[PDB]
Design a protein around this ligand. Structure first.
Ligand SMILES: [K+]
Ligand SMILES: [K+]
Ligand SMILES: [K+]
Ligand SMILES: [K+]
Ligand SMILES: [K+]
Ligand SMILES: [K+]
Ligand SMILES: [K+]
Ligand SMILES: [K+]
Ligand SMILES: [K+]
Ligand SMILES: [K+]
Ligand SMILES: [K+]
Ligand SMILES: [K+]
Ligand SMILES: [K+]
Ligand SMILES: [K+]
Ligand SMILES: [K+]
Ligand SMILES: [K+]
Ligand SMILES: [K+]
Ligand SMILES: [K+]
Ligand SMILES: [K+]
Ligand SMILES: [K+]
Ligand SMILES: [K+]
Ligand SMILES: [K+]
Ligand SMILES: [Mg+2]
Ligand SMILES: [Mg+2]
Ligand SMILES: [Mg+2]
Ligand SMILES: [Mg+2]
Ligand SMILES: [Mg+2]
Ligand SMILES: [Mg+2]
Ligand SMILES: [Mg+2]
Ligand SMILES: [Mg+2]
Ligand SMILES: [Mg+2]
Ligand SMILES: [Mg+2]
Ligand SMILES: [Mg+2]
Ligand SMILES: [Mg+2]
Lengths: 65, 378, 139, 94
RNA sequence: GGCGCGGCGCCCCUGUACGGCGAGGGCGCGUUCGCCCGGGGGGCGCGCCGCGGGCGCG
RNA sequence: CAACGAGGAUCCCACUGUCCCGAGCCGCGCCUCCGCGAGCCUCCAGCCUCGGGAACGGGCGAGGGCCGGCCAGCGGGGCAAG
RNA sequence: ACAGGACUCCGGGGUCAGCAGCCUCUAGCGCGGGAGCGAACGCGGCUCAGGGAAGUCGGCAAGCCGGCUCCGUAACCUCGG
């Protein structure tokens, strides 16, 4: 089906889930759940949150193409 | 003096009294009207509420702002194992309404039907239909007893029961219900059709069709004893009221010197008999078909049961039906489904592109157990 | 001839985030800084209920003390183009913005500015063609 | 006589009750669960059970306890000390 | 309505356990870091099984 | 008239369940049970509509309703009590 | 007969500006009784999207602020603030 990738983590989002946010520099952000949206607003660094795509990439556990 | 500003009353007086329902289950009080000449068909079925999901569908409307676009809609899932027809009843239209002629039962009656006749089954002495089975053994008695319904009745119904050993429920006794035979050419053709269904199973795909509308009848969620703010929706009083602000302040004028039945009072909320009408059918399938919930838009094989299982219901084993929207009751209430008495006229067709099978226990993100395994592949 | 009211077509209902008394930001370059919302058009009310508006609705405003002197002391029509209350579209998308904003525009649909800053919603761009043409981003 | 071994989940038995009386209510639930298990009407507990149930105050009682019921004469319960409860079930002997 | 108790699987929630071993501003000491480790803990939803589950009153 | 005030007023910023419009949760009462166990008040009684009447009746004239016995709540009436 | 009233003496440790608040060694241990359930409604508390006094006679009630160090401080004045 048509899918999106969470902008905070790297997960896939299925039709009818999560919510979007329109930033004022004219950039859109797509969130998987409310947990992911609270992490972004508080300015918690994605690489320090160990379950994200960004963390596992920085830890060698995720292969970067 | 006159009430200074204008404002309607709160709540609908046509759903009074707000008492607990005393009927056992939802009871179908009306049937769709018979049309002399129409093809014969059944009008009702009985299922159990399994769960909710949402779907993607392509809208084909005309003049609508969604004319050639995609919409996401909520659907409800109802579990419908086949019912067994066990008896035939006829009625006559008389100057006192509907009066019955006789009820003709089948020769051989199953355990789920026999348990509904007893309070405790293990302990009881079993003397239901003990004489009837002996007499009715030879099939001649049925033919003679059907020789009356052909001669005196205007309306024919079949008696049918569910099979609760094909569900995740706890009960072992069936739910018994009359189903009216509409259509046909005359009365005598509707009794040849009812006899050809005796002791046989009936599937829900042979009553309802896709895109038609139905009515759902059930008993609502219960909340027990509840005050006026929640029971009736009246305004909450200001903060510095001495003895509490969850009340109606004035419950009547001095005259008349009684409390009127139109005033909001506290009491039982929920567990009511209700009817929600005009529900469109989305899909009729079976859970044994492993391709039941797969559009082309996905390539894996998906079926009706979600990852994790239907929360607070259990597993679905056979046939099911899918209606748009919502219906009364919690999970596992029996729901009666009939044809729509006065259906909505401008409803578009049904064209499904995607169905959600992700987990409803929590916030599941995997359509199938197989691809969750590929995700955590170590 | 020449009638041409404001608002092209029909709209589905969405969540209204702004009731009477709210103060929102000015998104065009007319000169105003904040707009005080005092009424909503097409509003039949009910007892005790505040009037409320969402993106795409036409509202009546007054220009606050930080805005230009000529624009002040008058009841001015405007359209809301961004809101913070999250709303659901028909295709199942939930979306919200970072701030609350509007533009000054007469019921014939002609703007009082030359620009709009930041993104605007699709709700406001479909009803008001002039907004769709001078906007730089539509979400 | 016969000797049982059984675990009782204690966090589940204080569900729905005020936490200010969790340990007293756990004591009253061990007796009710033992009496059914051993088919008796008189449950003498050992103070080893009392010390374990109360070991974290009146509110936060331990999640699980492992018992040992000796069917005598009544039933006599003492506390059995284990490191973990991974796949432990009912053990009846005698 | 022969209950339930207690397990094992699935699925979810939190966010990577104690420990062992090898980076750390500095002066054997050392906050913290990396690896074993989407780990450990938990469950009131779903699926299947050790102890058990049909008195007395009218 | 500077300083001062649990003194009377109007406005603004900030703040908020005051409000739009309400929702969920905690403890203790209430509620059910074992033990204990009172006050106030009482012509007689205790379902309504109209008429007449000390001009607004539970009883009187005429009509309409209604086995009997109880609980959790409630504040229209008893021109309720003090 | 009783959450009221009823003078004085002796006064450890930790945190801290401290005889404040919060935890504690020594010493002392009642308070017209218990169990079950987890309705309305009350009494004492907690949290609430978007808006922010539109509520009300009236910002009543609640909330915001707050320790220490450094920076920076107007009108007016009886020259002390
Ligand atoms: K009035
Ligand atoms: K009035
Ligand atoms: K009210
Ligand atoms: K009244
Ligand atoms: K009433
Ligand atoms: K009322
Ligand atoms: K009431
Ligand atoms: K109804
Ligand atoms: K908003
Ligand atoms: K002075
Ligand atoms: K003073
Ligand atoms: K004074
Ligand atoms: K004063
Ligand atoms: K509430
Ligand atoms: K009169
Ligand atoms: K009269
Ligand atoms: K009188
Ligand atoms: K009166
Ligand atoms: K209760
Ligand atoms: K009440
Ligand atoms: K005000
Ligand atoms: K105050
Ligand atoms: Mg008061
Ligand atoms: Mg008072
Ligand atoms: Mg869920
Ligand atoms: Mg009002
Ligand atoms: Mg680690
Ligand atoms: Mg609300
Ligand atoms: Mg009287
Ligand atoms: Mg009389
Ligand atoms: Mg009264
Ligand atoms: Mg709020
Ligand atoms: Mg006002
Ligand atoms: Mg007002």
């Amino acid at each position: 089906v048509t899918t999106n990738q969470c902008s905070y983590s790297g997960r896939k989002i299925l039709p009818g889930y999560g919510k979007r946010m329109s930033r004022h520099d004219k950039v859109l952000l797509i969130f998987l759940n409310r947990k992911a949206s609270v992490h972004y607003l508080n300015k918690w660094n994605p690489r320090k949150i160990r379950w994200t795509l960004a963390s596992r990439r920085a830890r060698g556990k995720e292969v970067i193409v | 003096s006159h009430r200074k500003f204008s404002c309607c009353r709160k709540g609908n007086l046509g759903y009074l009294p707000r008492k607990r329902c005393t009927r056992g289950r939802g009871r179908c009080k009306t049937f769709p009207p018979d049309v002399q000449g129409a093809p014969i068909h059944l009008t009702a079925f009985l299922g159990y509420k399994a769960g909710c999901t949402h779907v993607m569908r392509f809208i084909d409307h005309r003049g609508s702002n969604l004319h050639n676009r995609q919409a996401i809609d909520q659907a409800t899932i109802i579990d419908a194992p086949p019912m067994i027809c066990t008896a035939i009843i006829g009625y006559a239209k008389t100057p006192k309404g509907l009066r019955a002629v006789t009820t003709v039962w089948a020769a051989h009656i199953a355990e789920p039907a026999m348990r509904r006749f007893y309070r405790n089954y293990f302990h009881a002495e079993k003397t239901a239909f003990s004489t009837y089975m002996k007499k009715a053994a030879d099939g001649t008695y049925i033919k003679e007893q059907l020789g009356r319904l052909k001669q005196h009745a205007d309306v024919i119904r079949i008696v049918a029961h569910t099979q609760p050993a094909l569900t995740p429920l706890k009960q072992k006794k069936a739910d018994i219900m009359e189903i009216q035979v509409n259509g046909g050419a005359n009365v005598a053709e509707k009794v040849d059709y009812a006899y050809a269904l005796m002791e046989k199973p009936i599937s829900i795909k042979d009553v309802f069709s896709v895109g038609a509308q139905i009515d759902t009848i059930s008993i609502t969620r219960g909340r027990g004893f509840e005050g006026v703010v929640t029971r009736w929706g009246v305004t909450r009083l200001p903060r510095k009221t001495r003895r509490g602000n969850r009340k109606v302040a004035c419950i009547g004028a001095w005259h008349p010197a009684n409390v009127q039945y139109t005033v909001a009072r506290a009491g039982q909320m929920g567990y009511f008999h209700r009817t929600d009408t005009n529900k469109q059918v989305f899909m009729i399938d079976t859970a044994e078909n492993p391709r039941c919930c797969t559009t082309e838009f996905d390539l894996t094989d998906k079926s009706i049961n979600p990852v994790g299982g239907f929360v607070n219901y259990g597993r679905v084993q056979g046939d099911f039906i899918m209606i748009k929207g919502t219906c009364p009751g919690p999970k596992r209430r029996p729901v009666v489904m009939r044809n729509a008495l006065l259906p909505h006229r401008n409803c578009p067709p049904v064209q499904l592109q995607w169905i959600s099978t992700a987990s409803k226990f929590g916030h599941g993100i995997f359509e199938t157990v197989e691809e969750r395994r590929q995700f955590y592949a170590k | 001839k020449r009638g041409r009211s404001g608002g092209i077509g029909n709209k589905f209902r969405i969540s209204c985030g702004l009731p009477v008394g709210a103060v929102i930001n000015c998104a065009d370059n007319s000169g105003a800084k904040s707009l005080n919302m005092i009424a909503v058009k097409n509003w039949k009310g009910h007892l005790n209920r505040f009037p409320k508006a969402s993106v795409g609705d036409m509202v009546l405003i007054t220009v606050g003390r930080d805005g230009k002197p000529e624009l002040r002391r008058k009841v001015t029509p405007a359209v809301v183009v961004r809101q913070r209350k999250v709303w659901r579209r028909k295709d199942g998308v939930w979306i919200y913005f970072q701030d609350n904003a509007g533009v000054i525009i007469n019921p014939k649909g002609e703007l009082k500015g030359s620009s709009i800053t930041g993104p605007v919603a699709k709700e406001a761009a479909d009803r008001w063609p002039k907004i769709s043409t001078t906007a730089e981003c539509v979400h | 006589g016969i000797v049982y071994e059984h675990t009782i989940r204690l966090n589940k038995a204080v569900r729905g009750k005020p936490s200010k009386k969790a340990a007293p209510i756990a004591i009253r639930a061990i007796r009710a669960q033992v009496e059914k298990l051993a088919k008796v009407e008189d449950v003498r507990l050992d103070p080893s059970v009392n010390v374990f149930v109360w070991s974290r105050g009146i509110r936060h009682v331990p999640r699980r306890i492992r018992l040992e019921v000796r069917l005598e004469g009544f039933a006599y319960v003492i506390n059995k000390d284990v490191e973990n409860f991974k796949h432990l079930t009912t053990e009846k002997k005698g």
